[PDB]
């Protein structure tokens, strides 16, 4: 009955998506041809008369070199070929080109396949979109993707899983230019929106998973485990079951603030799993470490508004509420005085499943915390400084302006970003 639609936008969306959909098939025991050798698969797969399953995913891309690798590999028989949407020409790291020039040629094809998938749904819990701030139409076409979804669909959930531009490492020069102009869309047309930046995931894989040389496949296996633990309360029985709309309402203090931080615990190797036990209290303390956080910001600087936790495995409610008491006793961590009861707890019996060839090991007890802090103002004023530092001498403006957008729209992104950072300042003051 319950079901969602995945919208993998961009080259990062495809590499994330095939990491997620590889994990889903082995989780539900479905072969690459789609036929198995119970309604757990109903949330993402669609049943036909012949015994197959079609994933409810739409791949949004503007370059054919990233779709044809999907159509050639092992999963060529899995996905329906009309779900993979390829543009004729890439915007090539341009928000403006994917907003006014390139994106309106295939905006009709995306909304048509959205209509077909939502027609098959008997009741639609929400949408998941996957994209990155850095790229052109991963940030650009996503901006006009939300405009059509919000107007057509009123109160349907639309989750925005994003990748923030890292403060130090980058693969572009116009990367801060693309990120700030997407603040207009996400502030207005997003029910929820996560972010993890790549520099933080770089620190964890070096020291926790014991990998000298990882690529984006080992990062996207980690991000697949985050989404799997989120949606498994929809797919499997739980001692406490938490739906998609449940923790959506319970983490946001204001409609202007819908930006949690995601962390996962434990992340250890199969040789280090031979040594250390993994209990409920041991994995609870690991989510509060600023080293193991998956965003380069320190909650020790800021203040927690609310907390959402997602437990999986041999998890007893006795040990959950015992470890919460220990965390409130330590004075290194703080909570705002206007949220005394800030936690939310969910438990599922099924342990997380592992992928063959992956880096992690199979674990009984795991937790995926969703905490909203005032430490996100640390990673915004840094990017607002660098967006102001480049734009002081008026650089790269001729490429964006000449494509159709006026020069005053850059100044519009200044005040909306300046006002949004002011709304996070008034949260942290105590009454």
């Amino acid at each position: 009955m319950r079901e969602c639609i995945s919208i993998h936008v961009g080259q990062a969306g495809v590499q994330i998506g095939n990491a997620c959909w590889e994990l889903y098939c082995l989780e539900h025991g479905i072969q690459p041809d789609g036929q198995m050798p119970d309604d757990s698969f109903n949330t993402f797969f669609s049943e036909t008369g012949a015994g197959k399953h079609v994933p409810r995913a739409v791949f949004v891309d503007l370059e054919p070199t990233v779709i044809d690798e999907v159509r050639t590999g092992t999963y060529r028989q899995l996905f329906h070929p009309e779900q993979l949407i390829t543009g004729k020409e890439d915007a090539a790291n341009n928000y403006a080109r994917g907003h006014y020039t390139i994106g309106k040629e295939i905006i009709d094809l995306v909304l048509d396949r959205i209509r077909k998938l939502a027609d098959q749904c008997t009741g639609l819990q929400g949408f998941l979109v996957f994209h990155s701030f850095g790229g052109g139409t991963g940030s650009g076409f996503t901006s006009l993707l939300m405009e059509r979804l919000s107007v057509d669909y009123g109160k349907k959930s639309k989750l925005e899983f994003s990748i923030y531009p890292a403060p130090q490492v980058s693969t572009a020069v116009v990367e801060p230019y693309n990120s700030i102009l997407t603040t207009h869309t996400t502030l207005e047309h997003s029910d929820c929106a996560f972010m993890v930046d790549n520099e933080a995931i770089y620190d964890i894989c070096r020291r926790n998973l014991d990998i000298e040389r990882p690529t984006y496949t080992n990062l996207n296996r980690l991000i697949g485990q985050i989404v799997s633990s989120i949606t498994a309360s929809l797919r499997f029985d739980g001692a406490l079951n938490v739906d998609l709309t449940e923790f959506q309402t319970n983490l946001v203090p204001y409609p202007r603030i819908h930006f949690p931080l995601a962390t996962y615990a434990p992340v250890i190797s199969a040789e280090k799993a031979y040594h250390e036990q993994l209990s409920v209290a041991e994995i609870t303390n690991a989510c509060f470490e600023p080293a193991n956080q998956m965003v380069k910001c320190d909650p020790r600087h800021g203040k927690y508004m609310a907390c959402c936790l997602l437990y999986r495995g041999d998890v007893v409610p006795k040990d959950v509420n015992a470890a919460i008491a220990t965390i409130k006793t330590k004075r290194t961590i703080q909570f705002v005085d206007w949220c005394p009861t800030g936690f939310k707890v969910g438990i599922n019996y099924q342990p997380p499943t592992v992928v063959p060839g992956g880096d992690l090991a199979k674990v009984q007890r795991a937790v995926c915390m969703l905490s909203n802090t005032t430490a996100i103002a640390e990673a915004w004023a840094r990017l607002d400084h660098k967006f102001d530092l480049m734009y002081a001498k008026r650089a790269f403006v001729h490429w964006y302006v000449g494509e159709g957008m006026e020069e005053g729209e850059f100044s519009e992104a200044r005040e909306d970003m300046a006002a949004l950072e002011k709304d996070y300042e008034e949260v942290g003051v105590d009454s």
Binding site: D243, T249, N250, K318, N321, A325, W338, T341
Partner: protein, 426 residues
């Protein structure tokens, strides 16, 4: 004869009902298929209080299971004793309440309130004469408490002179597991004070204290917590279906408990609870068990009567027991501990005795005591509701759903009226 229709609200109501009908079907000797396999004729002599006649020597419960997410509903039907319920009573919505009172009271509950009122009126007409109802729910979520407050308020006006029993699980400070949890409780208790006959105050936090210190549970899952709440529900209304020396049904236990119509929130406790090791050293006699009913460790609420005044007490005993002891021990408590007990009401304690014991036991007793110490649990909820509402926490999830902002202010003012009213009786 005197019949009770059972109502369950939400996921917490459905899990509570699953064990409650599991423990009393074995009490009446009912197989998983629903037939009768009995040993004594007294088991079938009163079965129409909670069951219905069916063709072929079968009996079905008179219960309706109401929630909004069908995921937990299939756990009830595919459970151990879920094949006995009639399928028309499973009344379910299509989307959740969002842990929101207003979604269950204004937005989505207004459509499901018509379905439950159609079913419950077709079942309340079947009996001889309607004694009353029951309601099992929790105040932590919006499914059980959102429309649960709305379904009571519509059926109270339709049935003006009846008995209305509600099982409330009010939020706890230590084992709080919801951010919007005081918003659910404080604005919903306004419906439990003006349109409800009786209410029991359960705390999950007190349930772990009993299961960890006393009952010796290494892993106390919600099944064993649900065992205690159902055993408390069984012991209160065992006089409905079983004869005794001195009996007291639900109506006679109620009118002697409530001195004023707006004071109907009690604290339960149960007494003969022991572990695997301490079973042998304990002797099951009357003065042994009356130590543990009044013991502050075995309360089913997170309030301490030593800080307050016992206003009216009940005790429903069970088993073949001598009436002299049931009376000399209870007057012994009243005279020795003369500081807590009120002075303006002498002979505070109500008394009931039943003959047949629970299986595996020879003697049992149930404690129900109303005091002024319940205002500990009410002021603690009130300050956490006032703290969030000063900066308007989560206001957009309730204002835009069909209700204004002044409904919280009258919720706080009426909540202030109740806690100040408890002081002047102290």
């Amino acid at each position: 004869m005197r019949e009770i229709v059972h109502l369950q609200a939400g996921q917490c109501g459905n899990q509570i009902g699953a064990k409650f009908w599991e423990v009393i079907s074995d009490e009446h000797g009912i197989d998983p298929t629903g037939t009768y396999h009995g040993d004594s004729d007294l088991q079938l002599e009163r079965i129409n209080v909670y069951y219905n006649e069916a063709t072929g020597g079968k009996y079905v419960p008179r219960a309706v299971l109401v929630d909004l997410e069908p995921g937990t509903m299939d756990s009830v039907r595919s459970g151990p004793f879920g094949q006995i319920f009639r399928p028309d009573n499973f009344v379910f919505g299509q989307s959740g309440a969002g842990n929101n009172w207003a979604k269950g009271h204004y937005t989505e509950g207004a459509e499901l309130v018509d379905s439950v009122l159609d079913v419950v009126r077709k079942e309340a007409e079947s009996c001889d004469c309607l004694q009353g109802f029951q309601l099992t729910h929790s105040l932590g979520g919006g499914t059980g408490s959102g429309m649960g407050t709305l379904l009571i308020s519509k059926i109270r006006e339709e049935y003006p002179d009846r008995i209305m029993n509600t099982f409330s699980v009010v939020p706890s400070p230590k084992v709080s597991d919801t951010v919007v949890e005081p918003y659910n409780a404080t604005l919903s208790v306004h419906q439990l004070v003006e349109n409800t006959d009786e209410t029991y105050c359960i705390d999950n936090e007190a349930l772990y204290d009993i299961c960890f210190r006393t009952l010796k549970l290494t892993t106390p899952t919600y099944g064993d917590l649900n065992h205690l709440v159902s055993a408390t529900m069984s012991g209160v209304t065992t006089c409905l279906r079983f004869p005794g020396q001195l009996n007291a049904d639900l109506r006679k236990l109620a009118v002697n408990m409530v001195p004023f119509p707006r004071l109907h929130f009690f604290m339960p406790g149960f007494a003969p609870l022991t572990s695997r090791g301490s079973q042998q050293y304990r002797a099951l006699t009357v003065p042994e068990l009356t130590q543990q009913m009044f013991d502050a460790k075995n309360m089913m609420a997170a309030c301490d009567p030593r800080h307050g005044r016992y206003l009216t007490v009940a005790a429903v005993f069970r088993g073949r027991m001598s009436m002299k002891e049931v009376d000399e021990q209870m007057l012994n408590v009243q005279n020795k501990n003369s500081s807590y007990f009120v002075e303006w009401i002498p002979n505070n304690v109500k008394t009931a005795v039943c003959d047949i014991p629970p299986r595996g036991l020879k003697m049992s007793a149930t404690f129900i005591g109303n005091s002024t110490a319940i205002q500990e649990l009410f002021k603690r909820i009130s300050e956490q509701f006032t703290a969030m509402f000063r900066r308007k926490a989560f206001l957009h999830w309730y204002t835009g759903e069909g209700m204004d902002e002044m409904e919280f202010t009258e919720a706080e003012s009426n909540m202030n009226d109740l806690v100040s009213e408890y002081q002047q009786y102290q």
